[PDB]
Ligand binder design. Sequence first.
Ligand code: GCP
Ligand code: MG
Lengths: 62, 327, 48, 48
Amino acid sequence: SELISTVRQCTKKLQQYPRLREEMERIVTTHIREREGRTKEQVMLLIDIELAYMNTNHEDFI
Amino acid sequence: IPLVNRLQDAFSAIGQNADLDLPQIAVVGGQSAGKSSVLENFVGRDFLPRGSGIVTRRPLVLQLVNATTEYAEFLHCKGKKFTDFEEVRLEIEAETDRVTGTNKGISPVPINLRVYSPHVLNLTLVDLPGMTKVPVGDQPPDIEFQIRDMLMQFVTKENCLILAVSPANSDLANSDALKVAKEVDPQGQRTIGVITKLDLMDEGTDARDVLENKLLPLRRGYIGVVNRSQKDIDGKKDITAALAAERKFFLSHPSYRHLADRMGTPYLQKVLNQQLTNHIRDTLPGLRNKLQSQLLSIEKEVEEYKNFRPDDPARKTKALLQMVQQF
Amino acid sequence: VNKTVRDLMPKTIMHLMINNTKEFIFSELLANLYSCGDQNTLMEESAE
Amino acid sequence: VNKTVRDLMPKTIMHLMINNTKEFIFSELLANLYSCGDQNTLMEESAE
Ligand SMILES: Nc1nc2c(ncn2[C@@H]2O[C@H](COP(=O)(O)OP(=O)(O)CP(=O)(O)O)[C@@H](O)[C@H]2O)c(=O)[nH]1
Ligand SMILES: [Mg+2]
């Protein structure tokens, strides 16, 4: 929600052109919303890795 | 049929509480412009109050939704399922009168109505009263400001496409629709202009200079429509012959035949479809994944379910063995 | 576990999203920007 | 970074390799073994 607004912030003011602040925003935002799926998948899989071994050899005191 | 309609049909079929998240549409203009008539012709079915004078005297929040077959429900006749549109229109006008009064008064309290249809989007249409300056009847002296801010509270929000309705009778420079359109949407990126009453222009005059988007250049262009006259409304003219007559008029008028393809109500429907198509995306990659995971959560059992035949010893014994092992 | 998720969750998002949309902006934006639309009725002067 | 890779190399291996081959054994092995052809020869009586 913050990066997709920063893209708007850096496209609204440089682009006087109509439809070129539209196609640009559309393409960049679609790429970002395509990447959000992959990053959410990786975060979920990181959690599912942290539910696998539950180490104790680390610096927690026994 | 449009692919956005087919996608909405598939969404209704899967029945999950998901939506394409289309922007709402608000139709605005001057009094007696033709706003309600354009709205009902875009819907496709005649269920709106249309007459001379002040008619649309209360903000109608329509919600077109998709279902198996068509009906309509208000938020006051709870449980009732209005089905015939003469009854729907009579109920609408009675509901307006029950709060506004029978002396051309208005009320900003919205009438929330929902229509069901087999092949429509989950749209959100907003019909609004026209803009007036001098109070008539028993309206308060500040009726202009009342209507102004009353429709501003609905239009000034984002994801609210604007249908700026203007007659072809008055010179375009007077358009109360265009004033608000350029006031709230300066760049004109969510504004569409429609010119009504093209059959009522003075002899020797034509709207070529405005329909070619030259007189007041607007980004989205101006769509010219020709609704049913008041005589036709009283005579109960039907939509199909009305559209045929509109097509005949566009093909016969020497100053518009070169734009007949781009003029007319079906073109306006197509343009709204195009805008909604361009607005539903930018969320599809989120939504495509959002239901791709849903398909993932069932593809495993779908493997057992694609090829099931009763009395299959292999599947029966395999299921028995795994059931026993887990027990 | 809280420490090792706080130290690692910024890295994963900023390798899969930030440093990938940034690379996309460098190296692919013009290629598909040419393709989307008309490539002719684009960058039309605003009336202003 | 050595601490963080040392705490997540085991977990990474096992969540993908071991705690998945275990579920494969407990769930899917029976289906493959019963579905492979020639049931009469999958179980050969040994002479012993
Ligand atoms: N001949 C002709 N008459 C039209 C055309 N469009 C609208 N009218 C007439 O305008 C009159 C009012 O139509 P309507 O759409 O209900 O206006 P309205 O916008 O609802 C009035 P308000 O918004 O102030 O409540 C009707 O008599 C209708 O026949 C047109 O294109 N051609
Ligand atoms: Mg009206």
